[PDB]
């Protein structure tokens, strides 16, 4: 089964799901870096800006809704956000499942209030599900209709916007052969990166740092120290919320590579700077940024949309691995 995705300025890739009877539709991101299903609830007080311009879920218009109401909580660097657990039929790419999701009653506004999509679908493992709730993909496996205990991602360059494939891969969007990397500590789609490189000066992640293959992440992230180092060491200036470089001097910034289980994944200037134009006047942003991630998971890096745009990604639960292939 394939889920068509939409790309909002190469920074947000979402899809559509259906909750309830009749199907209440939600625009959502499929995040391999989280494990629950979250949708803005209708019972979400309007006092939260995140609950004013996004589809809300009304249990009141669903014949299939089942009440549980367990309070869920998750603090996210601007943390807070909470709600309760509800059950109901969700539909993804044709498939139907009786899933447990959270209805957001409280939300820290940002970043959400800027989301062109409404909710998030956790593609992560059951080991990290709030309330220890069975993840959606897990439930889909239970039905035994798929072909492979796997699912692949494809983020496009923007302006088809993207595509997720449940239970398989799609050859139309990648070339070459998948080179796999085993998961460090299964329970997380995290792999053992072996050094980041800025081309000549392979100074970074020397030894053995970690890396998250986060589809729900738009940029590539690393500790604040790491990013600072990598940043200026590119001619990249630091701003209020993202590094940049005069637009006209972007096309000649070094290449970035990630030594991942046997191969060198390289991103070029084109892959990491939004070349709004080539003016020698205006500034241009880099699809990279600080972001400090807390343990036990981190501080690991985060290979998000920037990476995925270039390398088609497959997550294979069957063998706790992850493949990468030149995206086409
Ligand atoms: C290419 O990716 C993008 O463009 C992603 N992107 C853009 C804006 C943005 C915001 C949150 C995010 O989420 C990113 C994930 C990232 N991976 C780890 C993780 O833990 N995440 C995460 C964060 C926050 C969550 O909040 C759930 C509250 C329910 O409510 C969530 C909610 C309610 C109302 C409106 C939107 C909304 O967000 C889906 C759930 C999952 C990714 C985002």
Distance CA 165, CA 2 (A): 4
* Residues contacting residue 56 through CB under 8 Å, at least 6 positions apart: 39, 40, 41, 42, 44
Cα–Cα nearest to 298, from 184, 147, 216: 184
Is the distance from the beta carbon of residue 38 to the nearest atom of ligand 1 less than 6 Å?
yes
Q: Which of 174, 134, 136 is nearest to 155 (CA)?
A: 174
CA distance 99 to 87: 6
| Span from the CA of 24 to the centroid of ligand 1 (angstroms) | 20
In testing the pocket of ligand 1, which one of 29, 80, 298 has its CB within 8 Å of the most ligand atoms? 29
Nearest to 134 by CA among 94, 85, 169: 85
Q: Which residue puts its alpha carbon closest to atom 23 of ligand 1? A: 76
Which technique was the structure solved with, according to the deposited record?
X-ray
Q: Is the CB of 84 under 6 A from ligand 1?
A: no
**Ligand 1 in reach of 115 Cβ (< 6 A):** yes
Give Dmax (Cα) for the chain: 61
φ/ψ (deg, to 5) at 190? -115, 140
Which atom of ligand 1 sits closest to the CA of residue 11? 4
3-state DSSP of the chain: CEEEEEEECCCEEEEEEEECCCCEEEEEEEECCCCCEEEEECCCCCCCCCCCCCCCECHHHCCCCEEEEEEEECCCCCCCCEEEEEEEEEEECCEEEEEEEEEEEECCCCCHHHCCCCEEEECCCHHHCHHHCCCHHHHHHHCCCCCCCEEEEEECCCCCCEEEEECCCCHHHCEEEEEEEEECCCCCCEEEEEEEECCCCCCCCCCCCEEECCCCCCCEECCHHHHHHHHHCCCCECCCCCCEEEHHHCCCCCCEEEEECCEEEEECHHHHECCCCCCCCCEEEECEECCCCCCCCCCCEECCHHHHHHEEEEEEHHHCEEEEEECC
Task: Check if the beta carbon of residue 151 is closer than 8 Å to that of residue 167.
Answer: yes
Integer Cα distance of 143 and 25 in angstroms: 23
Rounded to whole angstroms, the Cα distance separating 176 from 83 reads: 44
CA-to-CA distance for 101 and 103, rounded, in angstroms?
7
- Tell which phi-psi region holds residue 307, choosing left (phi > 0), alpha (psi between -120 and 50) or beta: alpha
Structure tokens at 223: 């500790």
Residues in contact with 205: Cβ distance below 8 Å, sequence separation at least 6, in sequence order: 193, 194, 195, 196, 222, 226, 259, 301
Query: 310: CA distance to ligand 1 center in Å?
Result: 22
Among 182, 70, 78, 79, residue whose Cα is nearest residue 131:
70
Nearest-5° Cα angle at 225, 262 to 180: 15
161 lines ligand 1 (CB under 6 A): no
Resolution in A: 2.9
Compute CA distances 252 → 5, 70, 248, 266, 278, whole Å.
Answer: 32, 53, 9, 15, 12
Structure tokens, 4 = 């068509």
Query: CATH assignment of 1-169, given 2.40.50.140, 1.10.3720.10, 2.40.70.10, 3.40.50.10680?
Result: 2.40.70.10
Residue to probe by mutation, ligand 1, list 13, 48, 216, 305, most atoms within 8 Å of CB = 216
CB atoms within 10 A of CB 292: 14
Q: For atom 13 of ligand 1, which residue has the closest CA? A: 216
- Structure tokens belonging to residue 80: 């807070």
* Spatial distance between the Cα atoms of 34 and 102, rounded to a whole number of angstroms: 13
Centroid of ligand 1 to alpha carbon of 101 (angstroms): 15
8 Å CB contact between 57 and 118: no
Region label for 235, one of left (φ > 0), alpha (ψ between -120 and 50) or beta (otherwise): left
Q: Where in the chain is the domain with CATH 2.40.70.10?
A: 1-169, 170-327
Q: How far is CA 105 from CA 26, 131, 230, in A?
A: 16, 16, 39
**Terminal C-alpha separation, the chain:** 20
Tell me the C-alpha distance between 90 and 18, whole Å. Answer: 5
Question: Is the bond preceding 111 in cis, omega lying within 30 degrees of 0?
Answer: yes
CATH 2.40.70.10 applies to domain 170-327: yes
φ/ψ (deg, to 5) at 12: -140, 115
Q: Enumerate the active-site residues.
A: 31, 214
Centroid of ligand 1 to alpha carbon of 123 (angstroms)? 13
Name the residue with the closest Cα to ligand 1, atom 39.
119
Rounded Cα gap, residues 292 and 206, in angstroms = 18
Determine if ligand 1 sits within 6 Å of the CB of residue 189. Answer: no
- What residues have CB less than 8 Å from 298, skipping those under 6 apart? 210, 212, 223, 292
Distances (CA, A) of 107 to 39, 46, 51, 119, 241: 11, 11, 8, 12, 21
Q: Which residue has its alpha carbon closest to ligand 1 atom 40?
A: 120
What is the Cα–Cα distance from 120 to 136, expressed in whole angstroms? 11
What's the rounded Cα separation, in Å, for the pair 295 and 253? 32
Residues 6+ apart with CB under 8 A from 238: 228, 231, 232
Does the C-beta of 122 come closer than 6 Å to ligand 1? Answer: no
Which residues, 6 or more positions from 185, have their beta carbon under 8 angstroms from its beta carbon?
none
Q: How far is the CA of 105 from the centre of ligand 1 (A)?
A: 15
CA 272 to ligand 1 centroid distance, Å: 21
Residues 301, 212 contacting (CB under 8 angstroms):
yes
> Do 274 and 285 form a contact (C-beta atoms < 8 A)?
yes
Q: For 145, what's the count of Cα atoms within 13 Å in the CB-facing half-sphere?
A: 11
Measured distance CA(237)–CA(273) in Å, rounded? 13
What residue owns the CA closest to ligand 1's atom 25? 120
């Amino acid at each position: 089964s394939s889920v068509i995705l939409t790309n909002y300025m190469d920074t947000q890739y979402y899809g559509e799901i259906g909750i309830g009877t009749p199907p209440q539709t939600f625009k959502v991101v499929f995040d391999t870096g989280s494990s629950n299903v979250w949708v803005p609830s209708s019972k979400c007080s309007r006092l939260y800006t995140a609950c004013v311009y996004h589809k809300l879920f009304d249990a009141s218009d669903s014949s299939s809704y089942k009440h549980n109401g367990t309070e869920l909580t998750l603090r996210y660097s601007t943390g807070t956000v909470s709600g309760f657990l509800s059950q109901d039929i969700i539909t993804v790419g044709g498939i139907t499942v009786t899933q447990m999701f959270g209805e957001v009653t409280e939300m820290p506004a940002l970043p959400f209030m800027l989301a062109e999509f409404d909710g998030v679908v956790g593609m992560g493992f059951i080991e990290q599900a709030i309330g220890r709730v069975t993840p959606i993909f897990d439930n889909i496996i239970s039905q035994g209709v798929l072909k492979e205990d796997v699912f692949s991602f494809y983020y496009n360059r923007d302006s088809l916007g993207g595509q997720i494939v449940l239970g398989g891969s799609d050859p139309q969007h990648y070339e070459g052969n998948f080179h796999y990397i085993n998961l460090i500590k299964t329970g997380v789609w995290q792999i053992q990166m072996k050094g980041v490189s800025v081309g000549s000066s392979t100074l970074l992640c020397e030894d053995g740092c970690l890396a998250l293959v986060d589809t729900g992440a738009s940029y590539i992230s690393g500790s604040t120290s790491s990013i600072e180092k990598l940043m200026e060491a590119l001619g990249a200036k630091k701003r209020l919320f993202d590094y940049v470089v005069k637009c006209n001097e972007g096309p000649t910034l070094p290449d970035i590579s990630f030594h991942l289980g046997g191969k060198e994944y390289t991103l070029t200037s084109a892959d990491y700077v939004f070349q709004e134009s080539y003016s020698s006047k205006k500034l241009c942003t880099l699809a990279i940024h600080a972001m400090d991630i807390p343990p036990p998971t981190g501080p690991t890096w985060a290979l998000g949309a920037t990476f995925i745009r270039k390398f088609y990604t497959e997550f294979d639960r069957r063998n706790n691995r992850i493949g990468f292939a030149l995206a086409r």
